[PDB]
Amino acid sequence: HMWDTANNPLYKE
Amino acid sequence: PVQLNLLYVQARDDILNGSHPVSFDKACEFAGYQCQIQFGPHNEQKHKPGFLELKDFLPKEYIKQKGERKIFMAHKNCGNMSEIEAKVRYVKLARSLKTYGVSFFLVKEKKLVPRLLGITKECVMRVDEKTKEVIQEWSLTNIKRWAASPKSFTLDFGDYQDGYYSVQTTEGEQIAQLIAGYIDIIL
C-alpha cells in the first residue's frame, strides 16, 4: 500500500 | 403544509433515486405512505396490481422485485390517515433509519461480497448491500491512514486484531476526499 497518513494525534503525538 | 411538503419531497426523492439505501420492506412501507399521499385512502378495487408506475414509487433496485402486494398492504394500513399525517410519518420513518444522511459507495469485500460503505461527518460504516443493515461502524477520530488506488481503497483504524480494511472500488479517491475533509474538522 501507498498510504496517506491521517496525521491523527492519537497515534502521532 | 407547504413547508412540510419540502421536507417530504426531499426525503422521498433520496429514497426513490437511491441516495438513501433502504431495505425492500422499508421501501415498500415508504411507497405505502406515498400512495396514501397521492391517492388518499386505499381503494382495494382500483389500487391493485398494475395500477402503479413502479419506477415512481420504488428505488430502481426493487422494481423487478414484485413489491406491489406489500406496497398496497402498507397503503391499506394507513386507513383514512390524512395527507399531512402521511407525510410526517414518511419523513420521520426515513429519519429513524441509520442509513439516513449517509453518503454511500458500493464496493466489494473478501467470491467477493458487494457492500455499502458509508461515510458521515463522524464515522465509517459497513452496510449489507441487500438488507441495508449496519454490520460494523468505526469512529473517524480513530482513523490512522488510508490508501486509494484506481481499483481499491484501504482503511487503517489502528486495529491490530483483524488488521486493515480493504475493498474493491474505482471510487477510492472520491471516498478519500470525503474522509479528508471531514477529519479536517474533527481531528
Curated annotation (Swiss-Prot), chain A:
Phosphothreonine, modified sites: 5
Tissue: Isoform beta-3A and isoform beta-3C are widely expressed. Isoform beta-3A is specifically expressed in osteoblast cells; isoform beta-3C is specifically expressed in prostate and testis.
Subcellular location per the Swiss-Prot or TrEMBL entry: Cell membrane; Cell projection, Lamellipodium membrane; Cell junction, Focal adhesion; Postsynaptic cell membrane
PTM annotation, UniProt: Phosphorylated on tyrosine residues in response to thrombin-induced platelet aggregation. Probably involved in outside-in signaling.
Impact reported for residue 11 to A: No effect on cell surface location but impairs interaction with TNS3 and PEAK1
Residue numbers bearing the Phosphotyrosine modification: 11
Disease: Glanzmann thrombasthenia 2: A form of Glanzmann thrombasthenia, a disorder characterized by failure of platelet aggregation, absent or diminished clot retraction, and mucocutaneous bleeding of mild-to-moderate severity. Glanzmann thrombasthenia has been classified into clinical types I and II. In type I, platelets show absence of glycoprotein IIb-IIIa complexes at their surface and lack fibrinogen and clot retraction capability. Bleeding disorder, platelet-type, 24: An autosomal dominant disorder of platelet production characterized by congenital macrothrombocytopenia and platelet anisocytosis. Affected individuals may have no or only mildly increased bleeding tendency.
Other observations noted: The constitutive activation of ITGAV:ITGB3 on neoplastic cells may contribute to tumor growth and metastatic potential.
Record note on quaternary structure: Heterodimer of an alpha and a beta subunit. Beta-3 (ITGB3) associates with either alpha-IIb (ITGA2B) or alpha-V (ITGAV). Isoform Beta-3C interacts with FLNB. Interacts with COMP. Interacts with PDIA6 following platelet stimulation. Interacts with SYK; upon activation by ITGB3 promotes platelet adhesion. Interacts with MYO10. Interacts with DAB2. Interacts with FERMT2. Interacts with EMP2; regulates the levels of the heterodimer ITGA5:ITGB3 integrin expression on the plasma membrane. Integrin ITGAV:ITGB3 interacts with FBLN5 (via N-terminus). ITGAV:ITGB3 interacts with CCN3. (Microbial infection) Integrin ITGAV:ITGB3 interacts with herpes virus 8/HHV-8 glycoprotein B.
Record note on domains: The VWFA domain (or beta I domain) contains three cation-binding sites: the ligand-associated metal ion-binding site (LIMBS or SyMBS), the metal ion-dependent adhesion site (MIDAS), and the adjacent MIDAS site (ADMIDAS). This domain is also part of the ligand-binding site.
Protein family membership: Belongs to the integrin beta chain family.
Protein name, as recorded: Integrin beta-3
Organism of origin: Homo sapiens
Shown residues within the full chain: 765 to 775 of 788
Swiss-Prot record, chain B:
Region annotation (Interaction with LAYN) ranges: 72-187
Reported modifications of this chain: Phosphorylated.
Cellular localization per UniProt: Cell projection, Ruffle membrane; Cytoplasm, Cytoskeleton; Cell surface; Cell junction, Focal adhesion
Its biological purpose: High molecular weight cytoskeletal protein concentrated at regions of cell-substratum contact and, in lymphocytes, at cell-cell contacts. Involved in connections of major cytoskeletal structures to the plasma membrane.
Subunit structure comment from the entry: Interacts with PIP5K1C and NRAP. Binds with high affinity to vinculin VCL and with low affinity to integrins. Interacts with APBB1IP; this inhibits VCL binding. Interacts with F-actin. Interacts with LAYN. Interacts with THSD1.
Domain remark in the UniProt entry: Consists of an N-terminal FERM domain linked via a short unstructured region to a large flexible C-terminal rod which contains 13 amphipathic helical bundles (R1-R13). The rod begins with a five-helix bundle (R1) followed by three four-helix bundles (R2-R4). These are followed by a series of eight five-helix bundles (R5-R7 and R9-R13) in which the N- and C-termini are positioned at opposite ends of the bundle, creating a linear chain. The four-helix bundle R8 does not disrupt the chain because it is inserted into a loop in the R7 five-helix bundle.
Name of this protein: Talin-1
Organism taxonomic ancestry: Eukaryota, Metazoa, Chordata, Craniata, Vertebrata
Residues of the full protein shown: 209 to 400 of 2541
